[PDB]
Ligand binder design. Structure first.
Ligand SMILES: [Mg+2]
Ligand SMILES: [Mg+2]
Ligand SMILES: [Mg+2]
Ligand SMILES: [Mg+2]
Ligand SMILES: [Mg+2]
Ligand SMILES: [Mg+2]
Ligand SMILES: [Mg+2]
Ligand SMILES: [Mg+2]
Lengths: 128, 109, 236, 225, 125
RNA sequence: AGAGUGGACGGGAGCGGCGGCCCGGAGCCCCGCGGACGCUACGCCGCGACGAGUAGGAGGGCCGCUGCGGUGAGCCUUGAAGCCUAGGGCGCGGGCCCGGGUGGAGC
RNA sequence: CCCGUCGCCGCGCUCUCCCCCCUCCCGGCG
């Protein structure tokens, strides 16, 4: 029913959880997004057992499946019909996503042009 | 009509003293208390069967509340029965001490 | 077109050496020194249209996809399943009594006929004993016991193959949308050829089963585990 | 041009095929010769000892020229002299064996790094298992699996070493090009000893592993490769 | 010069679109619409591009003339083709290959023409 | 059709192999008109070894903030910024995109 | 040219002629 990608390998993620910041559960003033703990006694920086893990490059994902959505495609942000015309070749490897600022009539036009141009659209129903 | 599976017990996870590895399970099968008796069970399928709230689809039947985590016995763990098994998802820790079925599937006898 | 002239003793290794095989093939005398269509022409269909039309076959694609896939590499193993070597465990010889473990006929005791050409075992319960017809069953999912029925000189019909046993489909002819339902074909019909094949093979197996004592009661019964016996100690 | 050109390239392909057949026959015969040499050496040693027993004397065989050494302790808390000797032996990791040629200089530096290595005298089966299973060569500073006599010949053919059998023969019968063959060989990365060690940190003659077990290194090599 | 002009517009151009990990170009004679030296529609002595026609039927193939290289009014010759699919693919293939007019964009022009044709043909329900 | 681990011709002077009444001596492709992807060279691909880290140093950042020159025939009262989110995702990460709500003029 | 069942390595058969042993649409079948 939908538009299939060219190939669809099994995407393997080394880690699905996020890397939360140390003591961000203990405070509200500490936001969840990651800061590297510098601090002379700090036990997650020292990598003690059973602690918060720190991100490193060994968690990096396979470059064949990097940035790939859970249905075989890679996203491209589109604002209008000309930017859809640039996506004609990719087709089986790149899908479009209409930006959040595009109004109702213009995204109607974009979804119609993508339908006749066989480009996959991630958010086709956004003002209806 | 009749049981057709051997009864084992989830004894715990594979572990040292202060580190546990939840991808391997330790199983105590009833009746076997040496390695050269564990040799029979060495590739058999095994199942943790349990019930929950919602209904799940049953192969060849109508939906009910039973759920199964499948696995298989991989090798022996130490001198007195006690095999170690590998399940598709790691077993929940509320299953420790409970019943696990060893299913006589793929057969070599 | 001769036979192999070099019998194997361990696979990959012939028994006779290179010079011995030269001598056995007698290559000392038979040394040898030296030595569509794509287009057709259909007729004219004139007049004033003269010249027979040269027409090619397998024309160019009228469409090319916007990106293609590169072809694989070559792997040299990897034969399809129809060409695999079918192996059988040594304890299952024709006439052995097996125990079906997994199907709707869980824990049942049947006899073993020929093994089919796809590795699957053709068994029958003598259907008037335990309601098991001629079926296929997997070698990994039977347990082989040690009781025998000598089934030499039992006529097996040649039309008893995997194509004979392969499932049948009817859904769906010519219809794309479904709101009405097809309430037929869920009743799997036992065909008359299946019934008469069952009648023939049971009529030539069952008097041999009535010969040995207690075997028909044994085959009527089912296999089970109780509070005592453990399968690693059971002798089958 | 499209006929003389194609018959020329066909002649070239034929000549290359014939050269390949010649080199294959050569390496076959060489291996047969080494099989003769090995069995001759084995029976010769047995005959010598048996002759001395018949005469009533003693036969002292030649103390061996080849040793297999294995670094068996880790890299934490090592003396600088021990460190330098181990990296001159090319033992930079744990369970990291190699072949050494035994003389006074080599024996004294083994005596320096005694409590860090287990070493001994390998037999022909151990040299076969080591070069065939865990055989890697050093080809312009890379570690390449020995899958090809072409690889061996392109690195060591200037010494007459053109096959894995030539390599094994040099290493076992320590030739004049043993240094080049042993340096071509990347240091063997063995697995952990299957079955254990019974004590890592003491000498073999007092119940441990370190030092010179003489021919029990073959037992260790079977368990370890 | 093509190499000099590419070293100029390689990262600074009004046709360049850098968004999430991808790079595209929007100049009007760019098969495959990518930022590349091969598929650049402005810097080469010879360029071939294909577009949909003015009316919604057919494909216009525009090739760059040799002579008027500094006069952009006359520098492009475009022809509309409103045949069927196999003949339009055969005609643009014959054009590129038999003219020997930059014969490495041949298959890219083929893919683009087939995509434009399939989009032009009416949609089924 | 690009083809060279030596190719040149050209008299020079003889063979092996195809054409006999013993005399020989070019095929410039085609029944077809055709033949995937690639090479932002600051790109792409291959192989081998390696990966602790305070103080500190250096590199990369299509991480983030505000304003300026350009550029997007960019976005926006058919709803911008901001804010909320048991919604869908990406990225090792810094962070980001989309959906829903709220909001009411810019981004 | 519908679509590289290919390299190296290990083999088997044919472009020679004889045999002999189970067979076979077998042709009539005892
Ligand atoms: Mg993530
Ligand atoms: Mg917080
Ligand atoms: Mg400290
Ligand atoms: Mg220590
Ligand atoms: Mg062990
Ligand atoms: Mg110590
Ligand atoms: Mg580091
Ligand atoms: Mg909003």
């Amino acid at each position: 029913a939908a538009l299939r990608p060219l190939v669809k390998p099994k995407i393997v993620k080394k880690r699905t959880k996020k890397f939360i910041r140390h003591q961000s559960d203990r405070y509200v003033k500490i936001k969840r997004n990651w800061r590297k703990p510098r601090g002379i006694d700090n036990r997650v920086r020292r990598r003690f057992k059973g602690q918060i893990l720190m991100p490193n490059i060994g968690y990096g994902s396979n470059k064949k499946t990097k940035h790939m959505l859970p249905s075989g495609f890679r996203k491209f942000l589109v604002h209008n019909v000309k930017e859809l015309e640039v996506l004609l070749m990719c087709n089986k490897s790149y899908c479009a996503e209409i930006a959040h600022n595009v109004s109702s009539k213009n995204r109607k036009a974009i979804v119609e042009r993508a339908a006749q141009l066989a480009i996959r659209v991630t958010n086709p129903n956004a003002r209806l | 009509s009749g049981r057709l599976w051997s009864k084992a017990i989830f004894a715990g996870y594979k572990r040292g003293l202060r580190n546990q590895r939840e991808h391997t399970a330790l199983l105590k099968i009833e009746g076997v208390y040496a390695r050269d008796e564990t040799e029979f069970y060495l590739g058999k399928r095994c199942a943790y069967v349990y019930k929950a709230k919602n209904n799940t689809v049953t192969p060849g039947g109508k939906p009910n509340k039973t759920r199964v985590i499948w696995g298989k016995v991989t090798r022996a763990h130490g001198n007195s029965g006690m095999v170690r098994a590998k399940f598709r998802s790691n077993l929940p820790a509320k299953a420790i001490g409970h019943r696990i079925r060893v299913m006589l599937y793929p057969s070599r006898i | 077109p001769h036979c192999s002239r070099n019998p194997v003793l361990v696979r990959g290794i012939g028994r006779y050496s290179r010079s011995a095989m030269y001598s056995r093939k007698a290559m000392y005398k038979r040394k040898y020194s030296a030595a569509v269509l794509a287009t057709v022409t259909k007729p004219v269909g004139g007049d004033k249209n003269g010249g027979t039309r040269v027409v090619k076959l397998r024309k160019m694609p009228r469409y090319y996809p916007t990106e293609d896939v590169p072809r694989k590499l070559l792997s040299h193993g990897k034969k399809p399943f129809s060409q695999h070597v079918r192996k059988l465990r040594a304890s299952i010889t024709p006439g052995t009594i097996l125990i079906i473990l997994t199907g709707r006929h869980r824990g049942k005791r049947v006899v073993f006929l020929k093994q089919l050409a796809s590795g699957l075992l053709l068994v029958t319960g003598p259907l008037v004993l335990n309601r098991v017809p001629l079926r296929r069953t997997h070698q990994k999912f039977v347990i082989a016991t040690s009781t025998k029925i000598d089934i030499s000189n039992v006529k097996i019909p040649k039309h008893l193959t995997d194509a004979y046993f392969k499932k049948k489909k009817l859904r769906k002819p010519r219809h794309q949308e479904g709101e009405i339902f097809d309430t037929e074909k869920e009743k799997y019909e036992i065909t008359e050829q299946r019934k008469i094949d069952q009648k023939a093979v049971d009529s030539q197996i069952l008097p041999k089963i009535k010969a040995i004592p207690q075997l028909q009661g044994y085959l009527r019964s089912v296999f089970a585990l109780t509070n005592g016996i453990y399968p690693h100690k059971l002798v089958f | 041009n499209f006929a003389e050109l194609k018959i020329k390239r066909l002649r070239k392909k034929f000549a290359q095929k014939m050269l390949r057949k010649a080199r294959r026959k050569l390496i076959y015969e060489k291996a047969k010769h080494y099989h003769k040499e090995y069995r001759q050496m084995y029976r010769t040693e047995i005959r010598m000892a048996r002759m001395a027993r018949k005469a009533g004397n003693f036969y002292v065989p030649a103390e061996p020229k080849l040793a297999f050494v294995i670094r068996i302790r880790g890299i934490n808390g090592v003396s600088p002299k021990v460190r330098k000797v181990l990296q001159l032996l090319r033992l930079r990791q744990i369970f990291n064996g190699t072949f050494v040629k035994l003389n006074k200089a080599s024996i004294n530096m083994l005596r320096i790094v005694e409590p860090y290595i287990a070493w001994g005298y390998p037999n022909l089966k151990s040299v076969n298992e080591l070069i065939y299973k865990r055989g890697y060569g050093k080809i312009n500073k890379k570690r390449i699996a020995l899958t090809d006599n072409a690889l061996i010949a392109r690195s060591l053919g200037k010494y007459g070493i053109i096959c894995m059998e030539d390599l094994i023969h040099e290493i076992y019968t320590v030739g004049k090009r043993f240094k080049e063959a042993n340096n071509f060989l990347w240091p063997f990365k063995l697995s952990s000893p299957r079955g254990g060690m019974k004590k890592k940190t003491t000498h073999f003659v007092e119940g441990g592993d370190a030092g010179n077990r003489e021919d029990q290194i073959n037992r260790l090599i079977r368990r370890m490769n | 010069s093509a190499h000099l002009q590419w070293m100029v517009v390689r990262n600074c151009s009004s046709f360049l679109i850098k968004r999430n990990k991808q790079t595209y170009s929007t100049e009007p004679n760019n098969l495959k619409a990518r930022n590349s030296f091969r598929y650049n529609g402005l810097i080469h002595r010879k360029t071939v591009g294909v577009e949909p026609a003015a009316d919604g039927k057919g494909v216009v193939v525009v090739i760059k003339r040799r002579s008027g290289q500094r006069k952009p009014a006359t520098s492009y010759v475009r022809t509309t083709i409103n045949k069927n699919a196999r003949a339009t693919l055969s005609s643009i293939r014959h054009m590129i290959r038999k003219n020997k007019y930059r014969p490495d964009l041949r298959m890219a022009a083929i893919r683009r023409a087939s995509a434009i044709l399939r989009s032009q043909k009416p949609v089924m329900v």
